[PDB]
Amino acid sequence: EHPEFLKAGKEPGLQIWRVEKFDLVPVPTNLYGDFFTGDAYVILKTVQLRNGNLQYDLHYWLGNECSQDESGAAAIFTVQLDDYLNGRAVQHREVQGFESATFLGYFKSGLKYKKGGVASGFKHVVPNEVVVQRLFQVKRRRVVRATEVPVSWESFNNGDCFILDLGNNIHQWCGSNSNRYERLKATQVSKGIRDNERSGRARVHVSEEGTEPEAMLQVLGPKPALPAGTDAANRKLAKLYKVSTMSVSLVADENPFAQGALKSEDCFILDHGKDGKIFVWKGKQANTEERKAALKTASDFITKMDYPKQTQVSVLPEGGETPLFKQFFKNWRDPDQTDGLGLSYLSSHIANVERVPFDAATLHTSTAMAAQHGMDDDGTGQKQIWRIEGSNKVPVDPATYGQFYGGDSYIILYNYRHGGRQGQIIYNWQGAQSTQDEVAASAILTAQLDEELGGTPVQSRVVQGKEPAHLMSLFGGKPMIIYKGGTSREGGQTAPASTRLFQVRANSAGATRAVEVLPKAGALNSNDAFVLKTPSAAYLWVGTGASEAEKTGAQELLRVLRAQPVQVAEGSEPDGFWEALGGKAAYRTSPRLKDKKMDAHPPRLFACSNKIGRFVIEEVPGELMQEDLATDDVMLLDTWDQVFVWVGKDSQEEEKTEALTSAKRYIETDPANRDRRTPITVVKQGFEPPSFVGWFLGWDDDYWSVDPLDRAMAELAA
Amino acid sequence: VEHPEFLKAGKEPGLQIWRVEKFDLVPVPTNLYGDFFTGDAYVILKTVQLRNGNLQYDLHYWLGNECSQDESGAAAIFTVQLDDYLNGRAVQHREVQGFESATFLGYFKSGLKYKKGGVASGFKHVVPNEVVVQRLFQVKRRRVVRATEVPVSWESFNNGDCFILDLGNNIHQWCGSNSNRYERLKATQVSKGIRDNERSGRARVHVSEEGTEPEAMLQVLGPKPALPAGTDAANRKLAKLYKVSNTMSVSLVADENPFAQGALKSEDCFILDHGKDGKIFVWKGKQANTEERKAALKTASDFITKMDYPKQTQVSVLPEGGETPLFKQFFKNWRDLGLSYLSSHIANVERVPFDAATLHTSTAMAAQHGMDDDGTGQKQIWRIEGSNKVPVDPATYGQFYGGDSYIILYNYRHGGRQGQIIYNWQGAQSTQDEVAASAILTAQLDEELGGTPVQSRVVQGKEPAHLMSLFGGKPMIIYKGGTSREGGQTAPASTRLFQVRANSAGATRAVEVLPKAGALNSNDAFVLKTPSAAYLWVGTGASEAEKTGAQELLRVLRAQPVQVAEGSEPDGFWEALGGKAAYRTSPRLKDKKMDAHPPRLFACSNKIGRFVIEEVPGELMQEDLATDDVMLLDTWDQVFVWVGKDSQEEEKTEALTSAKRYIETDPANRDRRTPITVVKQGFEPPSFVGWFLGWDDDYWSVDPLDRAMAELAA
């Protein structure tokens, strides 16, 4: 029990200790983000779960020129502090330059890798005035890092940004070939020095090649000629091993894994090394020695498989698993939480998000509600529906609006209104039994209609059976009914199947959807109402979980089906029902996430590029901020229910046309084995729908009216 | 038809005011209702329409301080005789200047004006127009302001009150330097009342305070000199009941309340003595001699002389069968569409039956049923172990063991607003260290959540309606003892009896009770589990929801039921209770609950170290929620504590205690376990706001006094 242990993790916040001489010494709070390259640190992030318990993320950070003793000393402190916190903390091994996204999210003024350490006699605490003559190099995109560099022109290159810190004057230098997002972020390194390190009393001078002030030319000399500046299919696969010098044995050859494969007596390693991270899962009932040696366990597994030493390592206690970990498993369920608030773990970057329940009356006032439910509006706007025959849009009979045949593909042009600026959504619905010359036609025609309308409408491709929530809400109160095949083109109408089964599901908004499924018992579920119609009789089955909205939709389907139903509760019904299904087997009844879906699958922001033919994606750590949407990039906003494609105005055109495909490749490569039919929603810069903007607390509508870099330089210049 | 004015009296719902001039009744002009000459006496007839369609009469007569005994006696004579013209169905009130009843004050809360003069000095209400005016009013008090005419001089002024110097076409309101800013707010509709009613709109209102008096003011009053300074609760518990004979003598019948309703026989007249609280009631039996019934007012006067109560004591005379709710609450379990009496300040309230579908659209429905929402929002339940919140097993959500205390954090949505409720449930067998821990932990989490959540402390057995509705359709199950702690599990009782009661919303609650026949009730379903078998009893009154809840309780108890209607039951059912005795068969108030116990709003303070409460008369209005006060809203089923933003910290910390002490002192002998619900200004729940017709959500966005002064400054 260290004295620093007693101050650790008492209240939500961030705490940083430096390991100095086998002791924990606090880093001054205003310097959080500065890390000496020669040192090791311990970092405790305390989040307040909505259930009332506190959640602990324990990181230790190893600089590149770290000594072996203090590298080991940090590990000892994390192991011993996890114990002071009764083994409920999630532990992280972080090394300089390769830190986890979680760790990086704590500091979005960037981090600074300072030269020196305890061995060379350097501290964070500094006298009131101290002569400064440092230089920093700033590279990367999602989370910027400034590395202390030798004060010389040999450190410079055309393409990066540089901060030469002269004390009361901070000189930010932007290379000639630095594109303009990098200068913007390099400026919050400049201000961090001014505000945090100099208590405000300093000025920031920005310059580029050929406009260096004499103060800069005095220290570095005459400027010479500077030189130039200076992969996704890996993430799909992962294996699960069991831990017992200790050895390992494989348990699952490929993901998704069975949640039952983790037993509480042992420790497991989930190997995701080709993507740069390995997990260690501490069973509730493992040897005290195995749980205390989990970090050395991970170290030995990294040597054994010849993974890079910089590989990220996370250790998770049973019952405190992270959402990224649980997504490796098929249908993870925490036996606790369908009741209570939240789940075992609350991702730090959405811990501030206040949860808004859906209320149709006031939805038009809350972008938060629109995003948190995927509902741009209440669904009552004007709309036109086309069925695609051959290569043409053919208008659908307005009386049949809401009915969709699986042998067709459709286009919906919808006019939404929410808040202060109106917009349009183009839905491309592709039935599972539409001929793929027509599906492909529906795609092209969708893009054609987007550019006819000036290129501003949202485009969202949906596959039959995985319709987004806002799409079901477009038909007054009537349910969205989706037949498994056939066509509504005037030509060949067909004779309905002998015995058909429909599944009637509802969304946060009370709207309903009726999907045909093969008439078999293994396709039922207690969360929904169903409708089975035979030549004999007409059933309406109702699940234990099905509520009042599920049945209102279900009959109105009977009303369209030319029927009177037999109302039938779950488990207690005539034995004529299950003969109509050709027997009986198991069907899954575990309830749906609903309000906790955001807890189990927080939205994540990625950048993506198709350069040199390799797809590659970069997660953007920390809170979702509009500032991270680089106007020359195509971004991915994954909200689990759908993947948003944000295309910047100034992005390359080959990336713009491939926006749909890029998202499809993100889904195909997700280690969670995502549903291939997951809707993809392309979104243009400056015309983002509410269901996208709402995820960015502090979104400003005029953000791009003034160029972002030019505005930032106004704050420093005046 | 004693009088020509009698024929116009009480024909239509409204208010009627006559001044007693020369042993005659002459109408006060309607636009001047509220002005009263100190030298006169008035008769005031309030006519409200009962919910069945009949008219009910409240007859007041008002005695000014400078009233003559003859014209005061004439008012009393008229009150007795107009009660007679209305066939003796009226409740009569004796009101004296400055000490009027809350009922009387509710008629005028643009304030009252106590004018100088009277009939004897030849002054009338009707006056020629554009007439010279030079009057001065001192405006003190708080709940219902009173502006008394004072001499036009600086010697009438003081540091702390408000004053209106009425100059005719110019009305000057002066606010003393140390006048708190709610009283200035109140003086402001004293000022406009003169402007709108007395000056036909054509007049201007100039507000000023110490050191900014206009020259018009300094011309009339002179140079302003140095002004001087400005200028309980346990009484209401006890009351005694006497019987009246004839010269009058009295004899005691009930030493302390609650009284037996049967103690009043229809042959005699009774006096309920509550003089230490300032009121006495006299009760006229249906079949007493007219001679005693016509002298009820003189009887009350002489009884007040005998006990040396102050002359200003309020007097109400009640006819049998027409008693007021405040009167009936002195008796244990009073039994008579609507009821005998409808309190005036809720006669306009339209009653909303509960419909879950549109509850989110009607705050009125939320208040009238104690349901902030349908109960389906997200919630977290904690059990208190030692000094910690421990989350409950989600499988047992809805079950509560009486040997523990719990905290429930509930997220409600209603209309377009969000809110939170923290329920503190304290089991009857929880140890007092754990009870107290749950209390402290409750307050701790309220401040963790920014101080905005509603806090509601609940005692086992008196659960509010909205708490029972939180578990889908499953009933809130309440065991008599034991704990759900992962540590010591316990062995359930040999034979257990549950009482299954339902709410306005169909939600149910299953409360364990002693296995005795005298603990049954015809309105509810019951569940008896013995070692042998499990009965499910059903009452004459028990409905669909009562056994649906009762059934699923059997599902939790792992037992199969034998359905048993009341009066038609096996011997094993009555063996399992150890015999047979009488129990409760009187049906519940339900929709008439608001009629018998209308909501009432009080202000309370702990200043001087004594407790004090002041009732706020009239219609419940947001304006009466003084931002520097702690208010109590008693809805009988629950007591709301409304905490003003700008109240002292000693009062905020004692908000829970203040409500407990209000309950302890109620003469009705309220259930000590009555739920208390603390509520913060600007974060009021729908079940509170719904009682306030005209509630504005942005009312405090602009300061109330600043907004009021803009209306007069126009």
Short mmCIF file of N, CA and C in Angstrom, two decimals, chain A residues 48 50-53 335-342 354-357 359 362 369 595-596, chain B residues 360 378-382 389 391-395 397 409 411-413 415-416 418 445 448:
data_model
loop_
_atom_site.label_atom_id
_atom_site.label_comp_id
_atom_site.label_asym_id
_atom_site.label_seq_id
_atom_site.Cartn_x
_atom_site.Cartn_y
_atom_site.Cartn_z
N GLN A 48 -16.88 6.99 -14.57
CA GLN A 48 -18.04 6.72 -13.73
C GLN A 48 -19.06 5.96 -14.57
N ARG A 50 -22.64 4.36 -15.35
CA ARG A 50 -23.96 4.84 -15.00
C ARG A 50 -24.66 3.94 -13.98
N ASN A 51 -24.12 2.74 -13.71
CA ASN A 51 -24.68 1.88 -12.68
C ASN A 51 -24.23 2.26 -11.28
N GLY A 52 -23.17 3.05 -11.15
CA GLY A 52 -22.71 3.56 -9.87
C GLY A 52 -21.32 3.12 -9.48
N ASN A 53 -20.82 2.03 -10.04
CA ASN A 53 -19.45 1.63 -9.78
C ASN A 53 -18.50 2.47 -10.63
N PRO A 335 -24.85 -11.76 -18.45
CA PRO A 335 -26.08 -12.24 -17.80
C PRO A 335 -26.72 -11.21 -16.90
N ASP A 336 -25.95 -10.24 -16.43
CA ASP A 336 -26.49 -9.11 -15.69
C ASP A 336 -27.47 -8.31 -16.54
N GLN A 337 -26.93 -7.53 -17.48
CA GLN A 337 -27.58 -6.30 -17.92
C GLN A 337 -28.50 -6.50 -19.11
N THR A 338 -29.77 -6.80 -18.82
CA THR A 338 -30.89 -6.20 -19.53
C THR A 338 -31.59 -5.16 -18.68
N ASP A 339 -31.48 -5.29 -17.36
CA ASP A 339 -31.84 -4.26 -16.40
C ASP A 339 -30.57 -3.58 -15.88
N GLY A 340 -30.76 -2.55 -15.08
CA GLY A 340 -29.65 -1.71 -14.67
C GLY A 340 -29.31 -0.71 -15.75
N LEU A 341 -28.29 0.10 -15.47
CA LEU A 341 -27.85 1.14 -16.39
C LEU A 341 -26.49 0.77 -16.96
N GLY A 342 -26.40 0.74 -18.28
CA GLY A 342 -25.16 0.43 -18.95
C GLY A 342 -24.74 -1.02 -18.76
N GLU A 354 -24.95 12.26 -22.88
CA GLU A 354 -26.23 12.08 -22.22
C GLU A 354 -27.18 11.34 -23.15
N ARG A 355 -27.88 10.35 -22.60
CA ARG A 355 -28.74 9.49 -23.39
C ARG A 355 -30.13 10.12 -23.51
N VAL A 356 -30.61 10.23 -24.74
CA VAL A 356 -31.90 10.84 -25.05
C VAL A 356 -32.83 9.73 -25.52
N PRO A 357 -33.93 9.45 -24.82
CA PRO A 357 -34.91 8.50 -25.33
C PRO A 357 -35.70 9.12 -26.48
N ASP A 359 -38.59 10.49 -28.60
CA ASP A 359 -39.92 11.09 -28.49
C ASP A 359 -40.19 11.79 -29.81
N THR A 362 -40.74 15.82 -30.18
CA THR A 362 -39.64 16.77 -30.06
C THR A 362 -38.36 16.29 -30.73
N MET A 369 -30.97 13.07 -30.25
CA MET A 369 -31.97 12.02 -30.42
C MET A 369 -31.91 11.42 -31.82
N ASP A 595 -31.66 -0.04 -25.80
CA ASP A 595 -31.06 1.20 -25.31
C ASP A 595 -29.58 1.04 -24.99
N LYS A 596 -29.14 -0.16 -24.64
CA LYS A 596 -27.74 -0.40 -24.32
C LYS A 596 -26.89 -0.72 -25.55
N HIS B 360 -48.01 11.15 -21.54
CA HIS B 360 -46.91 12.06 -21.86
C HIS B 360 -47.39 13.40 -22.41
N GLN B 378 -35.30 3.66 -18.25
CA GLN B 378 -34.13 2.95 -17.75
C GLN B 378 -33.95 3.23 -16.26
N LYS B 379 -33.57 2.19 -15.51
CA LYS B 379 -33.41 2.34 -14.07
C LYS B 379 -32.29 1.43 -13.58
N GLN B 380 -31.74 1.79 -12.42
CA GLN B 380 -30.76 0.98 -11.71
C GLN B 380 -31.18 0.89 -10.25
N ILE B 381 -31.13 -0.31 -9.69
CA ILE B 381 -31.54 -0.56 -8.31
C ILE B 381 -30.31 -0.96 -7.51
N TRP B 382 -30.13 -0.33 -6.35
CA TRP B 382 -29.05 -0.65 -5.43
C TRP B 382 -29.62 -1.12 -4.10
N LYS B 389 -23.54 1.33 -1.83
CA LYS B 389 -24.54 0.85 -2.77
C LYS B 389 -24.02 -0.40 -3.45
N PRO B 391 -25.27 -3.15 -6.37
CA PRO B 391 -26.33 -3.36 -7.36
C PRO B 391 -27.03 -4.69 -7.16
N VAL B 392 -28.35 -4.67 -7.33
CA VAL B 392 -29.17 -5.85 -7.13
C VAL B 392 -29.10 -6.75 -8.36
N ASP B 393 -29.28 -8.05 -8.12
CA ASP B 393 -29.35 -9.03 -9.19
C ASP B 393 -30.49 -8.66 -10.13
N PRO B 394 -30.22 -8.41 -11.42
CA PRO B 394 -31.30 -8.00 -12.33
C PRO B 394 -32.43 -9.01 -12.41
N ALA B 395 -32.19 -10.27 -12.06
CA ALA B 395 -33.26 -11.26 -12.07
C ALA B 395 -34.30 -10.97 -11.00
N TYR B 397 -35.12 -7.88 -9.84
CA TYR B 397 -35.68 -6.53 -9.95
C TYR B 397 -37.19 -6.56 -9.74
N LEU B 409 -32.42 4.60 -8.94
CA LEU B 409 -32.21 5.72 -9.85
C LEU B 409 -33.02 5.47 -11.11
N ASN B 411 -34.84 7.03 -14.72
CA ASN B 411 -34.80 8.04 -15.77
C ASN B 411 -36.18 8.15 -16.39
N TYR B 412 -36.85 9.27 -16.16
CA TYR B 412 -38.18 9.49 -16.70
C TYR B 412 -38.13 10.48 -17.85
N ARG B 413 -39.04 10.31 -18.79
CA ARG B 413 -39.25 11.23 -19.90
C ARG B 413 -40.74 11.50 -19.99
N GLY B 415 -43.48 14.52 -21.90
CA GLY B 415 -43.46 15.65 -22.82
C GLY B 415 -42.12 15.67 -23.51
N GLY B 416 -41.49 16.84 -23.54
CA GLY B 416 -40.22 17.02 -24.20
C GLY B 416 -39.03 17.11 -23.27
N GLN B 418 -36.49 15.77 -19.93
CA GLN B 418 -35.99 14.65 -19.16
C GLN B 418 -35.78 15.02 -17.72
N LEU B 445 -25.71 10.88 -4.24
CA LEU B 445 -25.87 10.67 -5.67
C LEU B 445 -26.68 11.78 -6.32
N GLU B 448 -23.99 14.12 -7.03
CA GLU B 448 -23.20 13.59 -8.13
C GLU B 448 -23.85 13.88 -9.48
#
